[PDB]
Amino acid sequence: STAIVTNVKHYGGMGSALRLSEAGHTVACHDESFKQKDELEAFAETYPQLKPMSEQEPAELIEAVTSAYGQVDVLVSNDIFATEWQPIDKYAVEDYRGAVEALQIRPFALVNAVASQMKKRKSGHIIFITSATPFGPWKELSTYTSARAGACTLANALSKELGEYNIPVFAIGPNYLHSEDSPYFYPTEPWKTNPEHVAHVKKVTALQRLGTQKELGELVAFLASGSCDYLTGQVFWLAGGFPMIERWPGMPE
Amino acid sequence: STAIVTNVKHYGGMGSALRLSEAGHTVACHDESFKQKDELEAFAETYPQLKPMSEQEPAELIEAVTSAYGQVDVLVSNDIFATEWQPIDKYAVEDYRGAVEALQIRPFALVNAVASQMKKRKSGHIIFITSATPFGPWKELSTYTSARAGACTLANALSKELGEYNIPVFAIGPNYLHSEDSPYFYPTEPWKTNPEHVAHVKKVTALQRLGTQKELGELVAFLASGSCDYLTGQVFWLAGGFPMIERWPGMPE
Amino acid sequence: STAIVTNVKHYGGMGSALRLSEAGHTVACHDESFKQKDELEAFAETYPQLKPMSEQEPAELIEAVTSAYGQVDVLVSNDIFATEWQPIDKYAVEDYRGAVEALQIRPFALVNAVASQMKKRKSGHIIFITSATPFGPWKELSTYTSARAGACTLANALSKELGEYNIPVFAIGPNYLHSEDSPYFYPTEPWKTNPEHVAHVKKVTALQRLGTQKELGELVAFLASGSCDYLTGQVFWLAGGFPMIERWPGMPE
Amino acid sequence: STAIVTNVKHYGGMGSALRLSEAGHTVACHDESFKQKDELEAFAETYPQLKPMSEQEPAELIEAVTSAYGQVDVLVSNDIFATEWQPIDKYAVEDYRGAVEALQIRPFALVNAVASQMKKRKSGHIIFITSATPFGPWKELSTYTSARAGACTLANALSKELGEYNIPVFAIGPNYLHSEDSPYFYPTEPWKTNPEHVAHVKKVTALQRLGTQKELGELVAFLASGSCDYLTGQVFWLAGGFPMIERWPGMPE
């Protein structure tokens, strides 16, 4: 079984790839840095169980992995975009354009490229990593939030046609996921260190902590494993019970 | 009070313009066909209560109406897109891109242009016309369905930031809205004539009929009146009880 | 046209009753205080446009209004229940039974009693005043919240069978609805007087204010008017943009 | 670790208890028929890894299992209720009362009895087996459908308070979950043996098949493993892509 995990250095990329590997998949990895030969080799050295690819664009990635490992069985579109808190009228229109390109068009493109080989053999697993922000939106994050919602509905809508070919489709929408060295979106600094940040996280989640790469990775492996295909179409909120809702005056923390 | 309704010939364009004009708003009306003087001036003869405009692109549209009528008080983004049932692997990536430009980036651009003046007055009403398809996705309509979902969350996210400036933001998402002579998306032929189309609507909606422009016009006017601003954030499902879910074997219609 | 509003003194009862009357409905009013001829006659004096009934049980409440005005056209089940913040293990099970009785059984019993005459003349309007609590749960309000959610879905489920009879069904879920002198659930005091409470409502809603009885009443009258039946099965969040979600450290409110 | 599965011969009970035992939980099993010596003993010789109990009532069961095996670590409220297709005016009000008792009060009562011990040690796992009918309600199932939706929100709200104490709370809403010999709610005969039923499941699910008990049991065992507590508060729609929303005339199945 061959897996593809994108932007592997960021977001839920590492927890996906490491736990898919441990579960017996062959895991090919995309990342923007893998354009530079040193960074692809530094990573392939540090994680010899992972197979970093240099391919950057969606279609060529699917063919590069289909060529080298025979097929693509599991697609994890781990999508990222660097956003900015802005009031609506401060955005430029191209700001929304890049957001939909990185969080909506990119996963659509990969499914577009991998679908026929999955449909023809009637086997496959597709997982979008989206965002839990559609579920409780902060103000002044209009582009990133609305785009992630288009990705959630894309996964849901795709499950409706892909089920007849036995291809389950999933959307994992995290929030407050510890991203370690990656800045998307909760690096150890400052979310694990700065006490104003650790106290924010204890307030806004139910579990009063960040989620872990292992947790995200366990979910990806479980859905990728074929053990529960009947969840096809599900949007998962991986946000530790976010959002916590502000209660009336006089109520304890 | 001055209103803007887009693509006024199609979807819920007529009901919005026709009913906002009765509630006393000045209704500027946009449409692709108003590019040609002949089409625009025919429309203003047929509809003396309405004010057609030649301007077609977002910033120009806000400018012209603000120039002619002093300000833009109500924004009805009546958004449309040429559809096409298709499996995921048969779209071109350009098919999604265009679907997102028309159904996400365009309402965004309009809000992006008009928000500062509304925010200046600390008043305004913004209504996206979207789609009930995200609430019950059909298979093989994944570009139009997911794009429309991004437009709903954009409305809801926007409401969080603009409420501070006393601007409600709403999304009306319709399905099975009788579009008279417009092919977007339920023209009289065949949807009121063909006995297979007629029995489809009876089966899949709870009220067993198409939706009227008057009903959408009434909803748009109600929201733009300032009588129920406290509904801000709402995605309305204007779909007669769609979807009707298929019951067990041997059960009546 | 003849309408019933329950618990008229509390929650969305006064706004419903008053605005329904201004639109020309005969408004018969149920309330627990109307058991004393005292309270009934004082209400009838203060509100001569409203018709307070003594009947308390749902079946005989429906029949008495039917016997006095011929038929019931609009049902507004304005349900309430006295609430207690509790950890789950500190409730008695009876606390939840009482909550379900007031918030699911009661509106069920009323529609159980009124639906035949509505179905028969193939006209009628049913509106539940539920709650916006299911949309963003506070911790330690599990009984009241899960109960209101049951009523939200009962409204949506009722719309599926009743549209065949041209009966639309609605749920309206308020949060931070100013209830004047009613303690259910946002009386003028403390919520418009104590500046800590004033700051809480400015923090948690997008419009930074309470809802008004009139806003709720305009929504009910609009729904009850037959102007927009295609919205059947809708759950309206009348919570002024609640919930606002607490943002990252260092970010303005 | 000790787990309790209720109504274990029915619905998602056999998959919950079989799969949880394979993961090395002690699975105490509650079921109605275990009031009979011969029923409980037969079950125990056929399933030597499961521990059937005779206790029926919620407080009695938790205490028995805490008595025999020290504590309750995992609770699976597999709640079941017989009902009929019927219009709203045909139910007695007692029919909804019973639905609420069997599908809402009982899960509540189990958590109310066990929450205190789980909170004391700040560890535990609570899973409700509810229903996916609230996601796509059929007409004329208002009592069951709405009760289930109240259990879903019970789970979600309970997660917001038990997160502090590190107790994740989940709901799992099946539909078209094949139930083998149990009549709740998709027994093998007729759903896999009759062609009229075989085609219905092919039409209304995206995967065109029923859900196996192993799939539910795998889900239950995953959430009870402590490998993904960050999912706490999730309602999972274990229904295989249900519902498949009927498409325009002339379009193929």
Coordinates of N, CA, C and O in Angstrom, one line a residue, chain A residues 87-89 91 93 96-97 100-101 104-105 108-109 111-112 115-116 119 137 139-140 142-143 145-146 149-150 153-154 156-158 160-162 164, chain B residues 86-89 91-93 96-97 100-101 104-105 108-109 111-112 115-116 119 137 139-140 142-143 145-146 149-150 153-154 156 158 160-161 164:
Chain A
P87 N -9.6 42.8 8.4 CA -11.0 43.1 8.0 C -11.2 42.9 6.5 O -10.3 43.0 5.7
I88 N -12.5 42.7 6.1 CA -12.8 42.3 4.8 C -12.3 43.3 3.8 O -11.7 43.0 2.8
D89 N -12.5 44.6 4.0 CA -12.1 45.6 3.0 C -10.6 45.8 3.0 O -10.2 46.5 2.0
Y91 N -8.3 43.2 2.8 CA -7.9 42.2 1.9 C -7.8 42.8 0.5 O -8.6 43.6 0.1
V93 N -8.3 41.4 -3.5 CA -9.1 40.2 -4.0 C -8.2 39.0 -4.3 O -8.6 37.9 -4.1
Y96 N -7.9 36.4 -1.3 CA -8.9 35.3 -1.4 C -8.5 34.3 -2.5 O -8.8 33.1 -2.4
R97 N -7.9 34.8 -3.6 CA -7.6 33.9 -4.7 C -6.6 32.9 -4.4 O -6.7 31.7 -4.6
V100 N -8.1 30.2 -1.9 CA -8.8 29.1 -2.6 C -7.9 28.3 -3.4 O -8.2 27.1 -3.6
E101 N -6.8 28.9 -4.0 CA -5.9 28.0 -4.7 C -5.2 27.0 -3.9 O -5.0 25.9 -4.2
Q104 N -8.3 24.8 -1.7 CA -9.5 24.3 -2.4 C -9.1 23.7 -3.8 O -9.4 22.5 -4.1
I105 N -8.4 24.5 -4.6 CA -8.0 24.0 -5.9 C -7.0 22.9 -5.8 O -7.1 21.9 -6.5
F108 N -8.6 19.6 -4.9 CA -9.4 19.2 -6.1 C -8.5 18.6 -7.2 O -8.8 17.6 -7.7
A109 N -7.4 19.3 -7.5 CA -6.5 18.9 -8.5 C -5.9 17.5 -8.3 O -5.8 16.7 -9.2
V111 N -7.2 15.0 -6.4 CA -8.3 14.0 -6.6 C -8.5 13.9 -8.1 O -8.6 12.8 -8.7
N112 N -8.7 15.0 -8.8 CA -8.7 15.0 -10.3 C -7.7 14.1 -11.0 O -8.0 13.4 -11.9
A115 N -8.0 10.0 -9.4 CA -9.3 9.4 -9.3 C -9.5 8.2 -10.2 O -10.1 7.1 -9.8
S116 N -9.1 8.3 -11.5 CA -9.4 7.3 -12.4 C -8.7 6.0 -12.1 O -9.3 4.9 -12.2
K119 N -10.7 4.7 -9.3 CA -12.0 4.2 -9.7 C -11.9 2.9 -10.5 O -12.7 2.0 -10.4
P137 N -16.1 30.3 13.7 CA -15.2 31.2 13.0 C -14.9 32.4 13.9 O -15.7 32.9 14.6
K139 N -13.6 36.3 13.9 CA -13.7 37.4 13.0 C -12.4 37.8 12.4 O -11.3 37.6 13.0
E140 N -12.4 38.4 11.2 CA -11.2 38.9 10.4 C -10.3 37.7 10.0 O -9.1 37.9 9.9
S142 N -11.7 35.7 7.1 CA -12.7 35.4 6.1 C -12.3 34.5 5.0 O -13.0 33.6 4.6
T143 N -11.1 34.8 4.4 CA -10.6 34.1 3.3 C -10.2 32.6 3.7 O -10.8 31.7 3.1
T145 N -11.0 30.9 6.3 CA -12.1 30.1 6.9 C -13.1 29.6 5.8 O -13.5 28.4 5.8
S146 N -13.5 30.5 4.9 CA -14.5 30.2 3.9 C -13.9 29.2 2.9 O -14.6 28.3 2.4
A149 N -14.0 25.7 4.3 CA -15.3 25.1 4.3 C -15.6 24.6 2.9 O -16.3 23.5 2.8
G150 N -15.2 25.2 1.8 CA -15.3 24.6 0.5 C -14.6 23.3 0.3 O -15.0 22.4 -0.4
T153 N -16.8 20.6 2.2 CA -17.9 20.2 1.4 C -17.4 19.4 0.1 O -18.2 18.6 -0.4
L154 N -16.2 19.7 -0.4 CA -15.7 19.0 -1.5 C -15.5 17.5 -1.1 O -15.9 16.6 -1.8
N156 N -17.0 15.9 1.4 CA -18.3 15.3 1.5 C -19.0 15.0 0.2 O -19.6 13.9 0.0
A157 N -18.9 16.0 -0.8 CA -19.6 15.8 -2.0 C -18.9 14.7 -2.9 O -19.6 13.9 -3.5
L158 N -17.6 14.6 -2.8 CA -16.8 13.6 -3.5 C -17.2 12.2 -3.0 O -17.3 11.2 -3.7
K160 N -19.9 11.1 -2.2 CA -21.2 10.6 -2.7 C -21.1 9.9 -4.1 O -21.9 9.0 -4.3
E161 N -20.2 10.4 -4.9 CA -19.9 9.7 -6.2 C -18.8 8.6 -6.0 O -18.8 7.6 -6.7
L162 N -17.8 8.8 -5.1 CA -16.7 7.8 -5.0 C -17.1 6.6 -4.3 O -16.3 5.6 -4.4
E164 N -19.5 4.5 -4.8 CA -19.9 3.4 -5.7 C -18.7 2.7 -6.2 O -18.8 1.5 -6.7
Chain B
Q86 N -20.8 15.9 -13.7 CA -19.5 15.4 -14.1 C -18.8 14.6 -13.0 O -18.8 15.0 -11.9
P87 N -18.3 13.4 -13.3 CA -17.4 12.7 -12.4 C -16.1 13.6 -12.2 O -15.7 14.3 -13.0
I88 N -15.5 13.4 -11.0 CA -14.4 14.2 -10.6 C -13.3 14.1 -11.6 O -12.6 15.1 -11.9
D89 N -13.0 12.9 -12.1 CA -11.9 12.7 -13.0 C -12.2 13.2 -14.4 O -11.3 13.2 -15.3
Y91 N -13.8 16.5 -14.9 CA -13.6 18.0 -14.9 C -12.1 18.3 -15.4 O -11.2 17.4 -15.3
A92 N -11.9 19.5 -15.9 CA -10.6 20.1 -15.9 C -10.5 20.9 -14.7 O -11.5 21.4 -14.1
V93 N -9.2 21.1 -14.2 CA -9.0 21.9 -13.0 C -9.6 23.3 -13.3 O -10.0 24.0 -12.3
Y96 N -13.2 23.9 -11.9 CA -13.4 24.3 -10.5 C -13.0 25.8 -10.4 O -13.8 26.5 -9.7
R97 N -11.9 26.1 -10.9 CA -11.4 27.5 -10.8 C -12.4 28.5 -11.3 O -12.7 29.5 -10.6
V100 N -15.3 28.6 -8.7 CA -14.9 29.3 -7.5 C -14.9 30.9 -7.8 O -15.2 31.7 -6.9
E101 N -14.5 31.3 -9.0 CA -14.4 32.7 -9.3 C -15.8 33.3 -9.3 O -16.0 34.4 -8.8
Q104 N -17.6 32.2 -5.4 CA -16.9 32.6 -4.2 C -16.3 34.0 -4.3 O -16.7 35.0 -3.7
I105 N -15.3 34.2 -5.3 CA -14.5 35.4 -5.3 C -15.4 36.6 -5.7 O -15.1 37.7 -5.2
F108 N -17.3 37.9 -2.7 CA -16.2 38.4 -1.9 C -15.7 39.8 -2.4 O -15.7 40.8 -1.6
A109 N -15.4 39.9 -3.7 CA -15.0 41.2 -4.3 C -16.1 42.3 -4.0 O -15.7 43.4 -3.7
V111 N -18.4 42.5 -1.6 CA -18.3 42.9 -0.2 C -17.0 43.6 0.1 O -17.0 44.6 0.8
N112 N -15.9 43.2 -0.6 CA -14.6 43.9 -0.4 C -14.6 45.3 -0.9 O -14.1 46.2 -0.3
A115 N -17.8 47.3 1.5 CA -17.9 47.3 3.0 C -17.5 48.6 3.7 O -18.1 49.0 4.6
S116 N -16.4 49.2 3.2 CA -15.9 50.4 3.8 C -16.9 51.5 4.0 O -16.9 52.2 5.0
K119 N -19.5 50.3 6.6 CA -18.8 50.4 7.9 C -18.7 51.9 8.3 O -18.7 52.2 9.5
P137 N -25.8 17.4 -0.8 CA -25.1 17.2 -2.1 C -25.6 16.1 -3.0 O -25.7 15.0 -2.5
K139 N -24.5 13.7 -6.1 CA -23.2 13.2 -6.6 C -22.9 13.7 -8.0 O -23.9 13.9 -8.8
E140 N -21.7 14.0 -8.3 CA -21.1 14.5 -9.6 C -21.5 15.9 -9.9 O -21.5 16.4 -11.0
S142 N -19.7 18.4 -8.0 CA -18.8 18.7 -6.8 C -18.1 20.1 -6.9 O -17.7 20.6 -5.9
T143 N -18.0 20.6 -8.1 CA -17.4 22.0 -8.2 C -18.4 23.0 -7.8 O -18.1 23.9 -7.0
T145 N -21.2 22.5 -6.0 CA -21.7 22.3 -4.6 C -20.7 22.9 -3.6 O -21.1 23.6 -2.6
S146 N -19.4 22.5 -3.8 CA -18.4 22.9 -2.8 C -18.1 24.4 -2.8 O -17.9 25.1 -1.8
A149 N -20.7 26.2 -0.9 CA -20.5 26.0 0.5 C -19.5 27.1 1.0 O -19.7 27.6 2.1
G150 N -18.5 27.3 0.3 CA -17.5 28.4 0.7 C -18.2 29.8 0.8 O -17.9 30.6 1.7
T153 N -20.1 29.9 4.2 CA -19.3 30.2 5.4 C -18.7 31.6 5.3 O -18.5 32.2 6.4
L154 N -18.4 32.1 4.1 CA -17.9 33.5 4.0 C -19.0 34.4 4.5 O -18.6 35.4 5.3
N156 N -21.2 33.7 6.8 CA -21.2 33.5 8.3 C -20.0 34.1 9.0 O -20.1 34.8 10.0
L158 N -18.1 36.6 7.8 CA -18.2 38.0 7.6 C -19.2 38.6 8.7 O -18.9 39.7 9.2
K160 N -19.5 37.8 11.7 CA -18.8 38.0 13.0 C -18.0 39.3 13.0 O -17.9 40.0 14.1
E161 N -17.4 39.7 11.9 CA -16.7 41.0 11.9 C -17.5 42.2 11.7 O -17.3 43.2 12.4
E164 N -20.1 44.3 14.6 CA -19.6 45.4 15.4 C -20.0 46.8 14.7 O -20.2 47.8 15.4

